[PDB]
Amino acid sequence: EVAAVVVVGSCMTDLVSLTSRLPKTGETIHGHKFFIGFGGKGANQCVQAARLGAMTSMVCKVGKDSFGNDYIENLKQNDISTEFTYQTKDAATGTASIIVNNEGQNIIVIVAGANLLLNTEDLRAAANVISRAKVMVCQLEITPATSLEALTMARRSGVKTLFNPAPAIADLDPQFYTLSDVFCCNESEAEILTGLTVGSAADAGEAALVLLKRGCQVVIITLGAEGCVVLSQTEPEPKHIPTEKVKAVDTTGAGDSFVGALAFYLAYYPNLSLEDMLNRSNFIAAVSVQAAGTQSSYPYKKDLPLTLFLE
Amino acid sequence: EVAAVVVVGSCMTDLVSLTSRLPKTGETIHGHKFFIGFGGKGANQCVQAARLGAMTSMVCKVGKDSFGNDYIENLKQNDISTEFTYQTKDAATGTASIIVNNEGQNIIVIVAGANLLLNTEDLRAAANVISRAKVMVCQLEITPATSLEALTMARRSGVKTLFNPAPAIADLDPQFYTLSDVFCCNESEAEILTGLTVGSAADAGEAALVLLKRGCQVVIITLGAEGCVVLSQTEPEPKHIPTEKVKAVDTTGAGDSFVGALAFYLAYYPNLSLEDMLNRSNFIAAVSVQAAGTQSSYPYKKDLPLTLFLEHHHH
Ligand SMILES: Nc1ncnc2c1ncn2[C@@H]1O[C@H](COP(=O)(O)CP(=O)(O)O)[C@@H](O)[C@H]1O
Ligand SMILES: Nc1ncnc2c1ncn2[C@@H]1O[C@H](COP(=O)(O)CP(=O)(O)O)[C@@H](O)[C@H]1O
Ligand SMILES: [Mg+2]
Ligand SMILES: [Mg+2]
Ligand code: NA
Ligand code: NA
Q: Which of B185, B289, B290, B298 to mutate to test the pocket of ligand 2 (most atoms within 8 A of CB)?
């Protein structure tokens, strides 16, 4: 039952209130709807890869609380290995409290909580599962020392590293670049990392070259409805890969859908060209934007065209 | 065993994030702590009355969900009867999403949820607990038609009605006034209901008289550190009842403490004058503002002065 995709990253409870307008300082307002969902970039990416057919393992930490218990059940209901899903009494399960108005404007408060207490001792326990994987995926929602050690362990075992610098910090440790076989971010993260404005595929190609020279082997910048741009040490000329023109219902977590799809193709279809993998990943992310509710929008293999699983 | 105070009203899960500052519009920030607390004006008033030694019953509706199950455990931990706490598959437990900065400034979004599905069938099933009570307390955090039905059932049963029009609506149904034995609101609610300024005891006397003439038997406007102002159909000249001068730590939920204390005295010390009941209720609410965290700040009888529980008028 070997995991081909290991995700070392975050699980977060999403707490969403829908309002007619955002509250002002000192203001109590009444919203019209509240819901809970399962989020966190690590878990979102793992759930998309699992639903495409990947054997996955989620290395993460949640609270010894109701939210933590519910999160472990969510991973098992998506056929994800929870062998190295830890729980702790020392902090609450990570939370994202989101207030959203009718026009889709928001205010968000994140408390990473238990996610931050995933430590190098917890990783070292997963050494054998990491060593037998094809792809290791990380983000920036846990403690950086933990993510850096995960990428180091992957490299030592010859496991391909897929790094998503999300959310982005302007002074990212240079080892994040040099430990990344595939570096994938969105337009706003590329602007934070490079200081360049990114308002077109051409601008994304300029930002991607900066990231390449910092030591990345492959750089992908996602561009929402414009698909993505890719370049590599072997092919440094930026290629624009356009996506399905669709009617977006809810673009929340499309980035995570795209990253989880890419992990699945890197693990299970290593013979496909990068261009082909990014075309399929674009298509899967595009399906996700045509439904509401983050993980509940992620498509399963049985509902996707057969051609996404050929060649 | 019989509940003398029946609260027909709201339970809300408080989902609290602590941050160094409140976010800007479109802004994502990191906070340093998230925790769950128990709120809702109905439950808050019930908890204060129960901690003063009242046998209470909370008529309410929560989700058939973990937040609802946890709310029922909270009520039981405060020795409240949950025999008429309903659940529903058709709505989540009410929620208050609260962001609090380091100076204690906040943003709150309330989604009433299951509280709005408390219905006429649910109240009819609670008819015996209502008819056996001394005082029925309600607010405006459930469907207002539901609060109006509870007040109607109380009045028909000769049960004293204590109505807190919170949060306030500018045009309440006229029966909210005529069915209220004791109508209790704060300065901001009085301003909404009357169209007047309510800043001082003098302003509160004018606003309280407009409310009394809509058909309330007793009107009480709370004035924070200035205590409260009362008048009644019997004694329409407003009286100003001042409160304990105290060093406030956290005034959140002081209104609910005051209303819960008042319910307690109406139920267990009916002999006392309104002025004596308000003096004691003010004192209890002032203890609550000396500690953080709404329900967790509400004092127990064992920690209060014995003089609050004398049957007779005290010096
Ligand atoms: N409006 C839209 N129409 C079609 N595809 C979309 C789309 N928004 C996003 N996608 C797809 O989802 C991928 C990732 O989306 P983003 O670049 O928006 C990352 P994020 O905004 O979720 O962080 C894109 O590369 C694209 O394939
Ligand atoms: N700073 C303070 N010092 C003493 N008592 C206070 C107080 N703030 C509130 N109280 C007590 O709590 C009662 C209800 O308080 P409020 O009138 O503040 C209700 P709110 O406007 O904050 O909802 C007051 O009548 C008084 O007895
Ligand atoms: Mg997007
Ligand atoms: Mg106050
Ligand atoms: Na979606
Ligand atoms: Na308090």
A: B289
Rounded to a whole number of angstroms, the distance from the CA of A27 to the nearest CA of chain B is: 5
d(CA A203, CA A62): 39
What's the per-residue H, E or C state across chain B? CCCCEEEECCCEEEEEEECCCCCCCCCEEECCEEEEEEECHHHHHHHHHHHCCCCEEEEEEEECCHHHHHHHHHHHHCCCECCCEEEECCCCCCEEEEEECCCCCEEEEEECHHHHHCCHHHHHHCHHHHHCCCEEEECCCCCHHHHHHHHHHHHHCCCEEEECCCCCCCCCCHHHHHCCCEEEEEHHHHHHHHCCCCCCHHHHHHHHHHHHHCCCCEEEEECHHHCEEEEECCCCCCEEECCCCCCCCCCCCHHHHHHHHHHHHHHHCCCCCHHHHHHHHHHHHHHHCCCCCHHHHCCCHHHCCHHHHCCCCCC
Has A256 been annotated as catalytic?
yes
Q: Give the C-alpha separation, A89 to A66, whole Å.
A: 12
CATH 3.40.1190.20 fits B6-309, yes or no: yes
Helix (H) or strand (E) holding A153: helix A144-156
Q: How many CB atoms lie within 10 A of CB B293?
A: 16
**C-alpha pair distances (Å), A259 with each of A74, A139, A184, A263, A270:** 19, 10, 8, 6, 16
- List, chain by chain if needed, residues with CB within 6 Å of any ligand 2 atom: B 186-187, 222-225, 227-228, 243-244, 246, 248, 251, 254-255, 258, 282, 285-286, 289
Contact flag B111-A66 (C-beta cutoff 8 Å): no
Relative to beta strand B95-100, strand B12-18 is parallel
Q: Is B315 an 8 Å CB contact of chain A? A: no
Burial A14-51 (b: 16+ CB within 10 A, else e): bbbbbbeebbeeeeebebeebebbbbbbbbbbbbbbbb
Determine the Cα–Cα distance for residues A114 and A83; give it in Å rounded to an integer. Answer: 17
Nearest CB among A25, A31, A111 relative to B31 is that of A111
Residue of B nearest to A93 (CA): B34
In angstroms, what separates the C-alpha of B111 from chain A's closest C-alpha? 5
- Backbone phi and psi for residue A16, each to the nearest 5 degrees, phi listed first: -115, 125
- Within an 8 Å CB–CB cutoff, is residue A143 touching chain B? no
In this complex, which of A15, A26, A112 lies closest to B97 when CB atoms are compared? A15
For residues B312 and B117, give the distance between their C-alpha atoms in angstroms, rounded to a whole number.
Answer: 42
Give the span between the Cα atoms of B216 and B185, in whole angstroms: 12
- Looking at CA atoms only, how far is residue B231 from chain A in angstroms? 30
Residues of B in contact with A141 (CB under 8 A): none
Nearest CB among B28, B66, B106 relative to A110 is that of B28
Residues of B annotated catalytic, as ranges:
256
B125's CB contacts (< 8 A; 6+ apart) are B84
Burial string for B159-181 (b: 16+ CB within 10 Å, else e) reads bbbbbbbbebeeebeeebbebbb
Architecture of the structural domain at A5-309? 3-Layer(aba) Sandwich (3.40)
Peptide-bond breaks in chain B following residues (C–N over 2.5 A)? none
Q: Do B29 and A95 touch (CB under 8 A)?
A: no
Task: Provide the 3-class DSSP secondary structure of residue A254.
Answer: helix
Which residue bears the tokens 């673009």?
A251
